[PDB]
């Protein structure tokens, strides 16, 4: 599957969400927009939410394979995550998820 992201390249940020990352880094998506820009976050301290495109990062689960052989866009609708301007529209909320377990550690 894919519950996290990993940057295979570094990109200079100068936007409102300007997030300076490095090549071959780990980052967890948080928001998404234009299915091109994703608001992820590092696993450091007081980090994120950092912005990261889908052309400079890959979706994975740090488990096995890559994107479980799926497209980032195909992995999006999968969870049916809300947009950035939609999700951020108001934190006050809560998303639910269906119970599903796979037969593979």
């Amino acid at each position: 599957g894919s519950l996290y992201a990993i940057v295979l390249y570094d990109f200079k940020a100068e936007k409102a969400d300007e997030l300076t990352t490095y090549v071959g880094e780990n980052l967890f998506i948080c928001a998404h927009h234009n299915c091109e820009w994703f608001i992820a976050k590092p696993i450091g301290r007081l980090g994120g939410p950092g912005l990261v495109p889908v052309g400079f990062v890959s979706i994975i689960d740090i488990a096995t394979g890559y994107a479980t052989g799926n497209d980032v866009i195909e992995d999006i609708k999968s969870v049916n995550l809300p947009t950035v301007q939609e999700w951020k529209s108001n934190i006050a909320r809560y998303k639910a998820s269906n119970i599903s377990l796979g037969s593979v550690e």
Binding site: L8, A16, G55, Q85, S89
Partner: peptide, 24 residues
């Protein structure tokens, strides 16, 4: 002709990452 609501919205379009499959 639409505005933005989010604060984490990007300003510029999609960049150009290396080792890609795009021609210029």
């Amino acid at each position: 002709s639409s505005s933005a609501n989010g604060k984490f919205i990007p300003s510029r379009p999609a960049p150009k990452p290396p080792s890609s499959a795009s021609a210029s």
